[PDB]
Amino acid sequence: VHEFAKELDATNISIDKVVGAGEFGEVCSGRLKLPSKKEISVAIKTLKVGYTEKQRRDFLGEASIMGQFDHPNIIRLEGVVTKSKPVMIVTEYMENGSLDSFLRKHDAQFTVIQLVGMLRGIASGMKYLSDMGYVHRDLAARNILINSNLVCKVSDFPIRWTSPEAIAYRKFTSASDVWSYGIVLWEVMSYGERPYWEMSNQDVIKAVDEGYRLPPPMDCPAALYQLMLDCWQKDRNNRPKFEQIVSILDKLIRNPGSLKIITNLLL
Numbered sequence: 301v302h303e304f305a306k307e308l309d310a311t312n313i314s315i316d317k318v319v320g321a322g323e324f325g326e327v328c329s330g331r332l333k334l335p336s337k338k339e340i341s342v343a344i345k346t347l348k349v350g351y352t353e354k355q356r357r358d359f360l361g362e363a364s365i366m367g368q369f370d371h372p373n374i375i376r377l378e379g380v381v382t383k384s385k386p387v388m389i390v391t392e393y394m395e396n397g398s399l400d401s402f403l404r405k406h407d408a409q410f411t412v413i414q415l416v417g418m419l420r421g422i423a424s425g426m427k428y429l430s431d432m433g434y435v436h437r438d439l440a441a442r443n444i445l446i447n448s449n450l451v452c453k454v455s456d457f458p459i460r461w462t463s464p465e466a467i468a469y470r471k472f473t474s475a476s477d478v479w480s481y482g483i484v485l486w487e488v489m490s491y492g493e494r495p496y497w498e499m500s501n502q503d504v505i506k507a508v509d510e511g512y513r514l515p516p517p518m519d520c521p522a523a524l525y526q527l528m529l530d531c532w533q534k535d536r537n538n539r540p541k542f543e544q545i546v547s548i549l550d551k552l553i554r555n556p557g558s559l560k561i562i563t564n565l566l567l
């Protein structure tokens with residue numbers, strides 16, 4: 301793990317609060333004193349006490365992966381603590397939490413441009429990840445974190461987010477991430493509505509396979525809805541690349557004049 305993750309000295313780490321239960325144990329908020337003496341807020345993921353050797357492997361393997369990325373829209377790994385206890389992964393702090401929860405608290409309270417800003421950020425981090433040959437496989441609004449300036453960053457802590465072919469025979473590529481991105485794009489313009497709500501999973505699979513798609517969110521610009529449908533092409537070879545998605549979003553930020561055109565599943 302130490303090839304990509306720095307071993308932090310625990311005396312440099314202060315715990316301030318428990319802010320959630322994660323999968324391998326709790327997540328906390330705290331501060332990290334860097335070698336240069338600067339102090340930053342961090343999120344601190346603790347490995348649960350009484351962990352098995354395997355959960356350790358997996359807990360840290362997440363840090364091996366994260367430590368390979370250095371990008372403004374990917375969660376930054378500050379380091380790990382393994383030569384003392386509890387075992388920790390320390391990451392940059394994101395004040396406004398998961399994106400889906402955050403947007404649900406603020407239904408219809410942002411401008412279309414603010415929302416596109418969030419989406420641009422996500423698209424840019426994914427462009428980087430796919431450039432490194434990484435397929436995320438769990439790209440979803442709940443795995444996107446958003447900081448106090450509304451900057452969104454890909455993270456990773458699922459039928460509704462998965463492409464038909466990935467569901468069908470585990471064909472996971474960057475194009476299946478692009479499918480998931482279109483779902484994220486729906487989640488954002490919907491302010492955190494569950495994709496396909498509570499439909500039986502069997503019917504989510506079946507409906508999408510027959511050509512049905514999520515409907516446009518309320519007041520959704522045509523441009524963003526068409527982008528969702530492009531992301532949701534049945535033929536994975538026909539989906540945009542992340543680089544094209546970023547380019548499209550950069551255009552809509554330049555001219556909100558394009559966004560003026562406004563638009564149960566649709567076939």
Ligand SMILES: NC(=O)c1c(N)n(-c2ccc(NC(=O)Nc3cccc(C(F)(F)F)c3)cc2)c2nc3ccccc3nc12
Pocket residue numbers: 319320321322327342343345362365366369374375391392393394395397398429436445454455456457
């Ligand atoms: N508020 C924050 O700043 C939080 C924060 N940074 N984390 C947190 C801790 C660990 C992760 N881990 C990862 O993102 N792992 C990971 C694994 C594979 C790939 C990638 C990626 F590179 F980005 F593709 C990341 C993600 C997020 C949280 N996990 C939480 C879990 C539950 C509740 C709140 C949480 N808050 C936070």
